[PDB]
Amino acid sequence: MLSGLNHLTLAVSQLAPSVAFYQQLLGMTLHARWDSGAYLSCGDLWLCLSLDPQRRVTPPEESDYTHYAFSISEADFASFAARLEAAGVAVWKLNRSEGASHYFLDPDGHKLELHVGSLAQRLAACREQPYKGMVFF
């Protein structure tokens, strides 16, 4: 039986700017670094950055909707978004769903999100206003 997400690994083209982005800009804890990668944590999340020459710096129009959302409190959301904006971090989408969301790109074009709200909150909203064709289990 699978019990959760064990780790998220992102392929990166340049290790130093990716470490700076996740550790310094985004505030994650750096636990180890080696010639070709790094291990960080963000709460329970184990993040691995893996130096990969096959990673392309990918414009958002050229990648699909796969994306990684990090939790933040409502109270902290706006100042964190403003921090990313001050740092010149690009936005790839505007929020049009329930719960605050800020959609931003990492240095290689990985699609990231700040989101406020749990699955339970989303399901409650959907039960009141179901998406087209929605069925619950």
Ligand X SMILES: NC(=S)c1ccc2c(c1)OCO2
Binding site residues, Mn ion, CB under 5 A: 9, 69, 113
Residue 12: CB atoms within 10 A of its CB come to 26
CA dist 76 and 11 (Å) reads: 28
Q: Which is nearer to a copy of itself, 14 or 36 (CB)?
A: 36
CA dist 23 and 19 (Å) reads: 6
Shortest distance in whole angstroms from residue 99 CB to ligand X: 24
CA dist 124 and 100 (Å) reads: 16
DSSP state of 24: I
CA dist 136 and 106 (Å) reads: 34
Q: Which is nearer to Mn ion, 24 or 132 (CB)?
A: 132
Q: Which is nearer to ligand X, 16 or 78 (CB)?
A: 16
The secondary structure element, H or E, covering residue 77 is helix 74-86
Determine if 73 is a binding residue for a copy of itself (CB under 8 A): yes
Interface contacts to a copy of itself, rule CB under 8 A: 1-11, 26-28, 30-37, 39, 41-46, 48, 50, 52, 54-56, 63-73, 76, 80, 98, 110, 113-115, 117-119, 122-123, 126, 130-137
Interface contacts to ligand X, rule CB under 6 A: 16, 33, 35, 133, 135
Annotated binding site for Mn(2+): 7, 67, 113
